[PDB]
Design a protein around this ligand. Structure first.
Ligand SMILES: Cc1ccc([C@@H](NC(=O)[C@@H](F)c2ccc(Cl)cc2)[C@@H](C)C(=O)O)cc1OCC(C)(C)C#N
Length: 291
């Protein structure tokens, strides 16, 4: 842990794709409004490498069109500016991303009616992307997280069925292997890592948005439900900060939520902690130092 670290929410969707970049400070309850993305995007992912925030993929649903994004953009909190980076090989909307040893893995997502099982890896110093082994399953709305330098792709939608399946990427073998399937089918879940487990919170089972939350213990290979969130949500933002899980916004079939809930694993409870400045879903979230 270190002092100064904010939860950054980029992009999102409410009626159309959004360009907002806003940062929450758990220490004081405040929100900062920062530089807008150069292009509005929903269905993107956020991550951090080297103190810099990256916005990856997504789609621009605007009045004039609906364009899937191959973009990678980098925000520097020291300048409050976005800078374009090299684009991915293919547009990826409803993407999932994970960082291993300073490299960004872009996983799955859609391009029109195409559902991608393809995965590619970004090298920041070289500003280059290269394809890695594809997943065993095509997954859009996929949740991705990294634990112990292994990358997990959880749930999603293959174009016909929402999935309870999950798989793991072993970088030294450039190989994907299926792990135990979740107890619940989830597309658009928030996926993150806390302690020695991969959590999957919320999402959509094709009928309902979910409030259940389950975690995969990488040693025992089981999925166990924990306490459910107060509010059902899908297409939520998620991150971990100071040993707690934060879920931001999402859609529950009636409202684009502004609710932010925080999970304490020691008490197995969720608390409501703040509200976003407006309700939105399909955002990209990550933590880095304050600007
Ligand atoms: C980021 C994201 C991930 C997963 C999904 C999945 N749908 C949901 O999760 C619905 F529960 C839902 C329905 C309506 C909304 Cl508005 C949100 C979610 C989608 C793959 C599926 O299984 O069909 C949508 C997503 O983004 C939709 C968008 C851009 C409109 C937003 N946000």
């Amino acid at each position: 842990p270190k002092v100064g670290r904010l939860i950054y929410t980029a992009g999102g969707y409410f009626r159309q794709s959004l360009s907002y970049l806003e940062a929450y400070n758990p220490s004081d309850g405040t929100w900062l409004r920062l530089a807008d993305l150069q292009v509005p995007r929903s269905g993107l992912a956020g991550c951090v490498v080297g103190g810099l925030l990256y916005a990856v993929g997504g789609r621009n649903n605007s009045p004039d069109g609906n364009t899937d994004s191959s973009a990678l953009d980098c925000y520097n909190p020291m300048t409050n500016q976005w800078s374009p980076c090299a684009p991915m090989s293919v547009p990826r909307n409803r993407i999932g991303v994970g960082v291993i040893d300073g490299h960004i893995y872009a996983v799955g997502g859609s391009h029109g009616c195409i559902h991608h099982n393809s995965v590619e890896r970004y090298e920041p110093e070289r500003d280059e992307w290269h394809l890695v082994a594809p997943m065993l399953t095509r997954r859009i709305g996929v949740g991705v997280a990294v634990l112990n330098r292994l990358l997990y792709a959880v749930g999603g939608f293959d174009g016909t069925n929402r999935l309870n399946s999950a798989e793991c990427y072993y970088p030294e073998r450039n190989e994907w292997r299926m792990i135990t399937a979740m107890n619940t089918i989830r597309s658009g879940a928030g996926v993150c890592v806390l302690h020695n487990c991969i959590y999957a919170a919320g999402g959509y089972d094709g009928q309902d948005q979910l409030n259940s939350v389950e975690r995969y213990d990488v040693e025992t290979e089981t999925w166990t439900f924990v306490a459910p969130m107060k509010h059902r949500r899908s297409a939520l933002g998620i991150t971990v900060h100071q040993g707690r899980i934060y879920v931001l916004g999402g859609y529950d079939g009636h409202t684009f939520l502004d609710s932010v809930e925080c999970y304490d694993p020691d008490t197995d409870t969720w608390s409501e902690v703040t509200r976003m400045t407006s309700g939105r879903s399909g955002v990209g979230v990550a933590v880095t130092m304050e600007p």
